[PDB]
């Protein structure tokens, strides 16, 4: 039962070395002359200053043309579905990162979560820019609300929410580790179906404006995955009494499930009607990412049959 | 008793016009194609993009010299006291703005609070830069910890915390309005003693490096005061059943008290030993700011005898 740190604790540890990710005894003054988690502070500077960007300084002259005329009915359908879902995710993220930040006892980590929260706000801004630019008013509202029409979308949403609401409802150390694992999956996996879609269009000279935006969001997402990787790993060291077998189990299940559901989504969005990728490929990408992410947090691959990356080209395309 | 909005509400209002600052019924998807609070969204763009800045791109070559040799024992004392306190305030702010953000039901306002939270993180970074630059390692740790020595500082801190902890402990609509009023005072008042100090040094060519930093923090602070002014005013319209007489009373008391305690601080810091301002001036500044701020949230002046600004010159100096 995670007690939320009070605003000022005069009986708080002076030694940065005594800091913990959770359940530490801080003053809650940001004593940033001493850093225990150099990665937390490095990631703050990287997200907050180095990688700063302005959505509206990206030019949206073309895409509205290509949307208006050059895109197939299936290509427009995927565009709507992917943007609707990513809008939902980034919305959940700005809201939920405030729950993590208020529970974390290392100020440098709180700093890194604050910057991540701000990056999620900019993403929300970028999607609003993309739609204000690329499509008409009614279509933009419809895309924001596409869950109101599409039960596969509505369910993806309610499901992601559920895991976060457990921790909000019942803020215990188990529901914390579960929520944190949820965050890592959501940013590990659930963005890269969408990222892959847009980078396909972009390979063939389709929607290069949108794809610029996405390159920045994707640069930010890799920082976010790295932050939560370190938090989960540091959480394992500092709190092994939380990575019980029952949990280490529930992790690998959800991590497999999630790799599944991302594929059932990638396939619903596209339906092999998109010139550049197919239901087979989808499966080899998510399976690939999923292994990686789970191994990067100290677990055995969940799909050993996969070891190459189907789309190794992305790594070079998405670059800025 | 403010129930904290769940992460996704499929029974949430579609019409932006139905949004409320608190106790609204949102989906918690950031439907930013429709804005009800244009000021909230304007303030987000202003804080997040327009006014972006990097503390470390400000040059800190000189100040360490002027600190090392050119500053009186009283001038060094004020420097330590003011920086120690402002470090404490910005720390409280990054932490507490997460409590407001999670309670607010208008996404554009949540967006504006997220950006403010990020600006508070940058301030934390700026103070760490200032001390890493301007003073030696042991002195920097001592300044972060100056509350551990100085009971006037320790009490200022515990007092600000107290008001925030009430709302955290007992998150009801009264403790919400109290906490929110606390935020407005803290950013209205408690920064401008410090701001005034540093701008004095800076007038006489003392610590112009620090003073650059402060100009940026002060530009950010005016955005923050404006945000909470609008929130309190919009809260009055949307929730008059909260600005009871008992509250409207407790407001004017605290607002007067706070103008008092800022002066008892300004005077402890300086002690008329600082060439540029005196215990009399201090009193005419805080009394001036305090009236203004309380009138700007629809109240009668608390010090009518004051109507001019003692230090009208600041407005022009602090500019960038
Ligand atoms: Fe995002
Ligand atoms: Fe993210
Ligand atoms: Fe600040
Ligand atoms: Fe502020």
Residue numbers in the entry:
A (entry chain AAA), B (entry chain AAA): 8 to 327
How is this structure described in the published paper?
Class I RNRs are composed of two proteins, a large α-subunit (R1) and a smaller β-subunit (R2) that exist as homodimers, that combine to form an active heterotetramer. Aquifex aeolicus is a hyperthermophilic bacterium with an unusual RNR encoding a 346-residue intein in the DNA sequence encoding its R2 subunit. We present the first structures of the A. aeolicus R1 and R2 (AaR1 and AaR2, respectively) proteins as well as the biophysical and biochemical characterization of active and inactive A. aeolicus RNR.
Another possibility for the low radical content and poor occupancy for the second iron is that the presence of a reductant (TCEP) during purification may have partially reduced the tyrosyl radical and/or iron cluster. We determined the X-ray crystal structures of TCEP free AaR2 and AaR2_genomic to resolutions of 2.15 and 2.10 Å, respectively. This is a significant improvement from the AaR2_genomic (with TCEP) structure, where the density for Fe2 was much weaker [modeled in at 0.25 occupancy]. The resulting crystal structures showed AaR2_genomic had full occupancy for both Fe1 and Fe2, indicating the presence of TCEP in the purification buffer was in fact affecting Fe2 binding during crystallization. TXRF analysis showed that AaR2_genomic consistently had a higher Fe content, and the activity was double that of AaR2, regardless of whether or not the proteins were purified with a reducing agent.
